[PDB]
Each structure stands twice: as C-alpha cells, then as structure tokens.
Ligand binder design. Structure first.
Ligand SMILES: OB(O)c1ccccn1
Ligand SMILES: OB(O)c1ccccn1
Lengths: 134, 134
C-alpha cells in the first residue's frame, strides 16, 4: 500500500549474483518500497572486516547499475544508529542473521539470505580447475 | 518521442562494470527505448569465441539484475539476421566497432564503447599484487 523505506548496507566488494539476490529480496519485502543501499568506506572496512579489493568509488559505481537500488549512501556509517534511521526516514533495515537486537526490539529488522557458491572468487576457482594438478 | 527498440548482444561472461556501462549506453541512445539483450549459447560461444566460464543460465540470471535491461533473449542467435530484427521489431543494433555492414546500410547500427581495465579478471590481478614476487 504505502511506500516503505528499506535500508541495506554492506561492502559490496566485487559485486556478484549473491549480492544482487540479497538486494532484490530487500527491495521486494513490501509491495511499494524505496531501497537505500549503504556502501562502507575503505578505511573502516579494512579496520573492522579485512581486505577490500575495490575502492569506495568503484563499489558504488557498480551498485548504481543494479535495478533494485533506489538510492545509495556512499560512504555509509559503519554502525546504524536510531538517529541515522530518523534522518533518512528508514522503516526497516534489511540484513541477514546481538548488534541488531535494538532493531528487532523496534520492529525495524527484516531478514534476508545469502546464496553460497555464486561469488566472484568462486568463479576463479572454476577457471583453474581446467588446469589439472598434473 | 516514440519508443525505440534497441538490441545488444554478447557473451556477458563474468559481468562487470564495463558490460554494465555498455548496456547503459545502448539503453540511453534515445529518450524512450526498450533494450533487448541477447545472450549467446554455450556451444556457439566456445566454438567461435573461446572459453566461457559461466553457463548460459548464470550469465542470463545475472543480466536480469541490471537496471538497463528490459528484455533478454536467451539463448540468442549467434548471427543477427534481417528476419531476426523483423521478428522482434528491433530498430537499432547497439554494438562497439565488416559483418555489420548491412546494419549500417539499413541505418540500424549504433556504436557503443568499451571501458578497458574494469574487468573481473583485472580485479584478480589487483589482488595478487599484494603478494610480491619475493
Ligand atoms: O559488511 B558488513 O558486515 C557491514 C559492516 C558495517 C556496516 C554494514 N555492513
Ligand atoms: O561476443 B560476441 O563477439 C558475439 C558473438 C555472436 C553474437 C553476438 N556477440
């Protein structure tokens, strides 16, 4: 019925079918949505998560081509706060399953899923199998 | 003004920013367009072009998430024919610069561009530079 603002965030390094399926799932949680995607900065990613191949600019420019994405916040904050949700009038945070306990308490948490084995790194492995060990 | 059917085709193996930028360019050739994207079959790709990492199903399922894509023909014919254009009411073929001489004669050819250095294979190279030769 009414339009619902959905927020999802992540690194989106080397975007693959698994990311795109997650975004599609967040986008379709309700009939009418605006999906805002938050892309994490290079420094914080490396400091808290580990290695990141593509810069912030590249990760963001790729996401702009995904049909489910309605707005991008780049860089986004590393931690979602209740004031961040207020600022951008966000109704739900979409994320895959506690740092989100407060989101669930407020009724603002919606789960989405991973798809294993569709990743960019996985494809390089399929390339190398064509080259037997001996 | 009027709606214009654009056709672009290719392998779309390991879809990257370079593919997505090409699609965006085809999609925006005119104000109002329908972009049909043709995805080549596995056999013909291997027989005429060479190695292809992802199957037809995977290459197609990824393209479905790109915002510029309005319809996918999967598999598409390896060679575009004047009867193929008639069948799908195609006004222009979008492709990067003769097998397309007849397209240009008919006023149905529109050039688009590559973006070098944005490829999936290129990113694996950036990963490995973190591992000095010695
Ligand atoms: O990819 B992550 O686990 C992450 C980190 C901070 C904010 C959002 N996502
Ligand atoms: O990627 B290709 O050069 C190609 C081959 C046949 C039809 C369309 N594109």
């Amino acid at each position: 019925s009414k339009n619902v603002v959905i927020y999802a965030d992540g690194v989106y390094d080397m975007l693959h079918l698994g990311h795109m399926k997650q975004l599609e799932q967040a986008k379709k949680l309700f009939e009418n949505t605006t999906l805002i995607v938050g892309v994490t900065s290079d420094n914080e990613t490396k400091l808290f998560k580990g290695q990141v191949v593509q810069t912030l600019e590249e990760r963001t420019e790729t996401l702009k081509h995904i049909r489910w994405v309605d707005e991008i916040i780049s860089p986004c904050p590393w931690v979602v706060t209740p004031e961040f949700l207020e600022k951008y009038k966000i109704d739900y945070v979409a994320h895959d399953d506690d740092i989100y306990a407060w989101l669930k308490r407020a009724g603002k948490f919606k789960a989405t899923q991973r798809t294993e084995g569709v990743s960019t790194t996985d494809l390089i492995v399929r390339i190398l199998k064509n080259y037997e060990d001996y």
